[PDB]
DNA sequence: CCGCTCAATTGGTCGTAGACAGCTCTAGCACCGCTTAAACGCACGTACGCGCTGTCCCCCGCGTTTTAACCGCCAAGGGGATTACTCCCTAGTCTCCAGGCACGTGTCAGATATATACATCCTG
DNA sequence: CAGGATGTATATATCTGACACGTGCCTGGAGACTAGGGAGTAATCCCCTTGGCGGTTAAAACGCGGGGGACAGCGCGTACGTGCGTTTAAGCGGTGCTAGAGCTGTCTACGACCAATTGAGCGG
């Protein structure tokens, strides 16, 4: 059905123009994206329920990212998320 | 040398109190939290929960440190025992 | 006309992530910045793992990425190893590592 | 300011005695202080993250319980 | 210019 | 008229469990016997840990249950120890255990 | 809080034993933890099967997934004994 | 009937070699067989539970993936 | 004739199997074992080939990590041979069987 | 007739 | 143990989630035969585990001295809960219509091969 | 060390299927509104957190003295690694069958949602 193969390939072609990817490595990257999506979404859901909020917003996603990703990974992901949100809302 | 230690083990294994003094632990917790947000207030229950968790974690780690000690044919626990226990747990 | 991924500068979908967030039953409502933030974070992590895996492949002198290259990229990076520390990668092997006492 | 020394050598000795330890090496106390420092930093970082998400300045026992729940150490008694 | 990462370099 | 919890034979609130399932964002619908089943499972587990804790309190010549007794009961039973294996009980202490090589 | 019902159950199992105020917070934590464990796995099972209803079947399967060995065998036997009495 | 002896000693030694093991005691193979049997029993029990909940008769790879994720052993590459 | 010292082929094997990503257990005996174990939980069970492959891919990584911990437990005892007690100490510390 | 288990009795 | 109000139960509709039958084909099981790679059995030797013994130093036990933890009390105010407007943000619904998914297609990255030269580890 | 043999990288040529692309198309995302509550904000109250002080005494710190234990070295014997020759199923490639997973199409009952009516569980 659905997968992230197209978007993983776009990011690959933009980060490594001449490197391809096998069908097994794509299955692994789809599993990776699904895993991390479910982790961030579950942590955001718990944050919303902890604070008696009935909506998941950008701040809950940011706090979930801070709780989950380690060290500088969290800092750079938070910076990228903020940049995307202020580019979208502009 | 060793009987007052077996008696100490028996004394502290049937006791449930906190073995770290509460004021130095509270100051340690506040000093650590000072690096994340300045002007941070703490509930008394927050520090009490932190101390219960920390003491349980340290007793559990010493229980594995002792097993790593007995594995190497020793009765003294050494820092290498803590490091082995923490590696096998996955913390290192 | 424009897509909400192109509106945010992303290559990962924000419409699909929005629909996954709404259907996944995480909250009664979902904001209009949660999908953009989540798609940006997912794209950043994908770009990191792929940028390291394409380097692992190139050191091996291959113009493709296989699961072994992804394992070599993940376990050799301190932060991606902590993030993916309970994860098994199929056909990924292990990091070549022999303890020093075993060597002659 | 050097409040890690407040976790005294007798206190570490009692914590080891509860763990069944009979003899303690003289370098175990500083290693234990480092281990405790790392554990406390990892828990109070998540507790503070939970605290500033509620726009609060007081760290709550529920923040500590949640920060412990997410590291696989569930705490019973404080809510 | 590719999508190089600033976390690594 | 039978309060719906005594209609099943339980001392745990079927209505409160139904409310919590409907408000916890678990699914879009909640069945009828789902709260009854969950309240029956919670009540039995409670009665079992409470069965062992009262026994432990009796062994210590006490007529009250303190965190020490709950900890003793949980960790002296293999299945409740397996279930509550990553659980820290406040003011619970440890199971008395010193190894053979340490004992003289 | 489940204090009233935990005390009702304790009077059924030990009629002459009391409970502390710190040992009741522990039982409240235990109930609120196990409820979240079963209801988060019944939730997972419904989504895996593309179902929107959490029935007694998902609760039974989640209990069998989370409870160890002989705990599950008796928790299931009590869950199907309560659903039977409740619908009859 | 007795299919655990199909996990031969050379296979266990190969797995040990991938784990960096240099010398292997002669009693390691039976301990490894018991450990693998226990691990497989635990994973397959949950896989079959997921199978029966869907009223299916064939165990899907997704059943195994779910049975592993619930033991904290999430596996990539199988869906 | 030409004999290697009894620690050389072992290190060469370590280098060989730490460089490959294959499956070190024969697939047919492992499939038979998986079928036999499941036979105690449900009769007339069927398996997707990918299900048995996932089971093998998980079991082999589990065993490799266990042997990685076992080697550390053996080195801690100033040994190079891994013994059953090293497996038991590893499993006890990581909670698998305490 | 106090409540008891059959898993324990 | 007493007061009372928030939460529980009951009655009734309706819409849709889920049960059930029919079907279609995919994929999982079962079998056969040949090849040969791998497992297995055995012999030899050596290197490692394990036990013993001895040194000396580090850890424990004990008796003073000091230090600060703990306890009780007094006081201030910072910020956590709570409540009452207001509006802005999100769900819901009905058009479009482009992006991504499901099949053809070939051509190159990868796997696989011998003749060759270079580099290993183990001795006499 | 010389060097002789084992392990192994290098140069150079054929498959070879799989991945990257082309193509039709269909459905899920986007756009443009409406409705209405969820969250924000301002005001307020009072709890509970922080800060200081004074006294006691329990615990920590310190020094000293033995001795138990960790570690080092040595010797032995046995068990595991290496290699070789033999046996045995793993694997690969068909060949065949059918059990059951996936998918409509239909219908029904079950749960959400709203309206009385209470009546028990929380605070004191």
Numbering used by the authors:
A (entry chain D): 34 to 123
B (entry chain A): 43 to 134
C (entry chain C), F (entry chain G): 14 to 117
D (entry chain B), H (entry chain F): 23 to 101
E (entry chain L), J (entry chain K): 361 to 369
G (entry chain H): 36 to 123
I (entry chain E): 38 to 135
Q: What does the study report here?
A:
pmcThe specific interaction of proteins with the nucleosome is central to the regulation of chromatin function and dynamics. The tardigrade damage suppressor (Dsup) and vertebrate high-mobility group N (HMGN) proteins bind specifically to nucleosomes via a conserved motif whose structure has not been experimentally determined. In addition, to study nucleosome structure in the context of active chromatin, we analyzed nucleosomes that were reconstituted with a promoter-containing DNA sequence from a Xenopus borealis somatic 5S rDNA gene.
To this end, we reconstituted the Dsup–nucleosome complex with recombinant Ramazzottius varieornatus Dsup and the nucleosome core particle containing the 601 nucleosome-positioning sequence and performed cryo-EM analysis. Two Dsup-bound nucleosome structures, which differ mostly in the dynamics of their DNA ends, were determined. In “structure I” (2.8 Å resolution), one DNA end is flexible, whereas in “structure II” (2.7 Å resolution), both ends are unwound. Importantly, the two structures contain extranucleosomal densities that correspond to two Dsup molecules bound to either side of the disk. The highest local resolution of the Dsup densities is 3.1 Å, which allowed us to model residues 361–369 of both Dsup molecules. Most of the interactions of the HMGN-like motif of Dsup with the nucleosome are shared between structures I and II. In both structures, the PPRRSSRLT segment of Dsup straddles the long α helix (α2) in H2A and has multiple anchor points on the surface of the nucleosome acidic patch and the H2B α1–L1 elbow. The backbone of Dsup R363 and H2B Q47 interact via hydrogen bonding, whereas the side chain of Dsup R363 forms salt bridges with H2A E56 and H2B E113.
